[model samples]
Target: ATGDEWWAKCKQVDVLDSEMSYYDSDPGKHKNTVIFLHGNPTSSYLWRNVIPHVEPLARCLAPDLIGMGKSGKLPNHSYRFVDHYRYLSAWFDSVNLPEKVTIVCHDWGSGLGFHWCNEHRDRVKGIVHMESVVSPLKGWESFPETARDIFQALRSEAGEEMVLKKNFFIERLLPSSIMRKLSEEEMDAYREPFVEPGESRRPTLTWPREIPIKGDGPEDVIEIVKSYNKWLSTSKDIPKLFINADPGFFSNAIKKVTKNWPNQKTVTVKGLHFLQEDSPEEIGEAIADFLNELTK
Candidate 1:
């Protein structure tokens, strides 16, 4: 690859035990600093294309979670929910973030963003999420019908074989969920960080098990998710944007439509679980609109 858009712009920073890689733009261009958080099976590459839309008016930063993307992976770490949170929060402390902060996140990143915002309530100006775990599920029964069984399997003992050995999250799940076919170049960017077979795939494996279903094993993560859900519902002061994929696997119409949160706005972007890949323009524009509304 002569110059991959994502890799060419990568900037590295030390965060606790790992070196986090990210893309940062807009040098205090405007009042807001937009933090784009990605989760499971993807890196900051998820927001590379989207950041341009918002970067014109604000500083946009997208960091690769530890053990994912270009970030350093710890050999002994399990890449659990808490482990990610520890490094991510530490990274925030290391960086000079702005007072008017806006979080735009996807997948498990929503949990991390909400968790951060709830704790640092005074700094957050707004938040936007999609294809994410915005609310804790009642149980497996509440998971999307198609993805329910797969997620159930992932949380079980057999998940090791499926995720680590078979590399299903990237090979199977990622490709299948997106509306359009990902080019070989696109797929390669995703696969670049995880070259060590099972060992390198630990972060992907940990994500499925972290889903906050009522009967899930990670009791701590579940409780933390519940706390954020409570904040989302009751924190009327914070403006929220929910960008839903029209026929999404996670952020589907029903989930977005039924979410009862104060100051929440829902917009439909045409895509699926991997909306960033299929609808980058729509996703970015929606966020830009939300940011302008909050800051104006």
Candidate 2:
């Protein structure tokens, strides 16, 4: 079947009383499910290449965060981190996912997965993540000068224009972050959700600004990340996988924190920030191997 046909097969679920779209694969084939969550400006479409490799090992599900895919964007919602969380949490409950599930997340999805794990630790078998804010910032001093400046700009008016008006996330960031050049067709798929780059691009706008900076940004979201960091440090029973890439945000400082995490493993691959675009096969294989190890 064609890629479009494959994606069309994904079943829809009700979340926060709105229709939420997700790609479900081999639902009844395995007791454990591998749930894949994509980040800003991307949908479950991000996992299209990765899921076929995983489906043989376990059932898989990839959900588009509300407002980011074919999912419903409520009439009056800001698409804030908390807003996404409410819908995701409700979706998890509605789906009745098995407790022994593996989470594979990238970008904002990684942040959401961490929060979900904190609240439902017993249900998460393990997590495999890349390009996400997985730890508490030591301080504003922790960010590189360029990063600090970028975060500051994102909170300003000019930054708002770039994201909401210019559609920078999809147009600029997505293409720049990947090593291999994306074809026109591939770019179109990523841009499908935000064809009109006004209010529809709110998630891309809000997520960057939410990056905590020197006691600024969304205090609640930052606090939730802090709590998840502690949970990551202390959760010895859970298996964790950290995937790192070059020209990516997961820094050496962050790596130091996760490197010694108990029951954790690390893999470094050659790629850019959006590693999935550069190394989907590599990532899928690594995750499948990790899952097999956990199952054994």
Candidate 3:
């Protein structure tokens, strides 16, 4: 079947109560589910190439965030990280996903997936992740210095302006970060969807605000991440595999949390944040291998 047809055939469901935007595929023709979550500046498109490789054998669910691809874009949306989680949880409720499922998450996906998985640990059997970590402590070693430094600087007046105006979307959202080379058409293929530009801004901006900076700033989300880190520190039941590219914001976060995680493994491949565009075939192989390992 064609790509769109494949995506369409997967059961679609509503999330967050605002609107529903998700695709579901039963790859293995079994009850086992593999839910893929995408992060900021992009959508489920990140898994464009990787999905087909494993779809033949594994059930998959990929959902776009509220302000993202194929999802609703109401003007009054709050666009907070909490909102993202709420919507995702609502989607899970709508679908009635059973326990003992695999979750593949990236970027903000880590945070969103972890928040839900921590509460419903019985539901998560395995995790496949990239470039994101879950820590429940405010001062965990997993936090990256570079990101912290940048965030620290951004909290100030001038740096915030520089960051906000720097056009944070598009570039980092793709599978390839800074290193992967893209043809004009390929770049446009990724860029054209956000032609309005502002459609991309909410994701870029809202995520940062969710991270508790310091000195009692933005306590709610911060506390939740820290609480998860606490659970992550003890649990040996869930298996985790970190698939990462070279040198990006996520590199540090991985180091911080994986310290105490049992059954945790990692692999590095070419390409930066946007690995799909830079090296789709390689990513497909990596994902396929992970899925294969889980079943075996």
Candidate 4:
């Protein structure tokens, strides 16, 4: 990356009552756009490798959702999934990108991006889903114990440090011994937000618990997952592909999509959850090919 084309305090948009600081990268040299939505722990920086490669063919947009990147930091307990969705919708409006969107989403990015699509499918071109899912509605099992703890801490009467722990989970659980190729500096960028006094974890802790396990929270992720399922099943005729690093986590979901969108496909590139960092060239090339195929 030559240097970041960054905008700070870009705007304070209303998610609910609170206004969160949203950041956006101005359109670059390319006309076609790829919006890279990142997951927990890591910010848009995860796309550093993949962005440049795609830039030659398309403009890439990466936003730091809520408390993740350098975006606005809401208190730990306040951030909610529905709120994040509204923020993202407004973000698209703010940026004035075409109604047609190309998403490269992972983890929480999947959740948020899908919600955005459900509301604005007309604007979405297709999806390049990676390393994440809609979980609840998408057949993701109930939140496991580890995830439960993080979510519970958010709305619970937990201390500040709990939020920090939530933030670290993205770095710690993701970069486990299984995928160790990511370097220290890379890990540092992934870990940077949570390390700051008491940051990052607000969203980290909030996201897991927001899954709408059984009852009513503000917004049920299960419903959102189901909405995405419908989008995959009935609405979209455009190309939608899955690129999974951990087949164990996403194999069944990919299988389900294939039943409907036969064009949907996934391949493993040797990398952890953050394939953009671990294997950007392969990821970028595959996406470019898919995009090109749409025209041909």
Best by lDDT: 1
| Candidate 4 lDDT over residue span 1-296, tens digit each | 31133233234455544444433444433357778888766677767667656766666788778776666766544667776787777777666585476888887888788778777768778788876664443222444434445456554667345556444465555575235466666666566656754554667766655654545453566677767766766654757777766533443455454555645766666565556666788888888877787656
Cα lDDT tens digits for candidate 1, 160-256: 9988898889889999888898888888888888766787898998999888878765788888988887888887898988888878887663365
Instruction: Give residue 283's error in model 1 in angstroms.
Output: 1.2
- Candidate 2, 155-216: lDDT as tens digits: 78877788878898888778877889987677777887788867888888888877654466
Report every candidate's CA lDDT: 0.83, 0.81, 0.66, 0.64
Per-residue lDDT of model 3, residues 1-296, tens digit only: 23344345444455545665676774334376788888866667667667777677677778877776667665764777777877888877776575677888877888888888888988888877776646433552434653555545544564434334554446543433546566665555445435554434555566655665445457887777877777766668777777776665565456665866777777777666655556667666776787778778
Give the 10-residue window scoring lowest on summed lDDT in candidate 1. 250-259
Deviation of model 1 at 209, angstroms = 0.5
Model 4 RMSD in Å is 4.3
Better of 2 and 4 by lDDT: 2
- Cα deviation in Å at residue 175, candidate 3? 9.1
**How many pairs of residues collide in each model?**
0, 0, 20, 3
Off by over 4 Å in 3: 1-12, 27-30, 136-167, 171-176, 183-189, 197-200
Instruction: Pick the TM-score winner.
Output: 1
TM-scores, all models, native as reference = 0.95, 0.93, 0.80, 0.78
